DNA sequence: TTAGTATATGTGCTGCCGAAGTTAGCACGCTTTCCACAAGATATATAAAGCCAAGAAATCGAAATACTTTCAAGTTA
C-alpha cells in the first residue's frame, strides 16, 4: 500500500530528524522493492514535505519543518514559505524588502508574518550596520555575523 | 654562405552603413524608521434646540357580514 509506504517513511523521518537514507529505509522495510520506494519518495517530494540532500554519504530525505511554528494565526503554508528564505539568509540576514520581493505577497502580510514570528520567538530583527536603511530579520537560535 | 620560406610591416584597398546635413517666395497664426513635538483623550455646567432611533396610541384601508333593491317566476283574482 502506497499509502502505508508513505507513512512509514514520514514516521522514520520524525524519529531521524536529520534525515534518512534509502539503506536505514530498505533496513526498516525490507520486504519492498526498491522501485516500490522509489515510487513513494517521488509522491512524497511531489506533495511537498519530503527534502532532498545530498551529503559525502549519498541521499537524505528530511521531513520538511513543520513543527517549529511561529505564526499559526492564518495558515503555516505562508509560515513556512517565509521561513525557508528566512533560514537561507540566516547569519547574512536579509532585508524586508528583499523579503517581500523573494514572497511576492503583500506589506501588510510580509509585516504580520514577522510580527508573528518575532512574538513567537522565531525571528530576531537586527538593524544593519552596513547600510541603516532597514532592520534585517534572521534566525533566533544563530549567531549574528 | 646563399636560396627558399614565414612574418609582420605599413599600406592600400573595399564597402559600410550611416551623417550631417541639405531642399525656393508672403499673410495668417516609493520605502524604512526615526523621531520628537505637540496633539488624542481624557472629568465638567451649561443654558439652548435639532436630530435619530425604541415604544405607545391613532387612525386609515379594507375585508367579511348585515340591509335594502331588484328582478323574475309564481300566486289569489
Redesign the pocket.
Known amino acids: 500500500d502506497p499509502v502505508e509506504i508513505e507513512n512509514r517513511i514520514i514516521e522514520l523521518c520524525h524519529q531521524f530528524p536529520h534525515g534518512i537514507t534509502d539503506q536505514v529505509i530498505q533496513n526498516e522495510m525490507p520486504h519492498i522493492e526498491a522501485q516500490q520506494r522509489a515510487v513513494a519518495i517521488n509522491r512524497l517530494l511531489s506533495m511537498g514535505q519530503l527534502d532532498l540532500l545530498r551529503s559525502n554519504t549519498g541521499l537524505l530525505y528530511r521531513i520538511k519543518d513543520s513543527q517549529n511554528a511561529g505564526k499559526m494565526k492564518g495558515s503555516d503554508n505562508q509560515e513556512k514559505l517565509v521561513y525557508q528564505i528566512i533560514e537561507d539568509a540566516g547569519n547574512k540576514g536579509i532585508w524586508?524588502?528583499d523579503i517581500?520581493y523573494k514572497s511576492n505577497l503583500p506589506?501588510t502580510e510580509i509585516n504580520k508574518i514577522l510580527k508573528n514570528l518575532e512574538s513567537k520567538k522565531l525571528i530576531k530583527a537586527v538593524?544593519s550596520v552596513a547600510a541603516?536603511?532597514?532592520?534585517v530579520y534572521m534566525l533566533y537560535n544563530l549567531q549574528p555575523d
Open positions: 524586508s524588502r517581500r506589506l538593524k541603516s536603511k532597514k532592520k
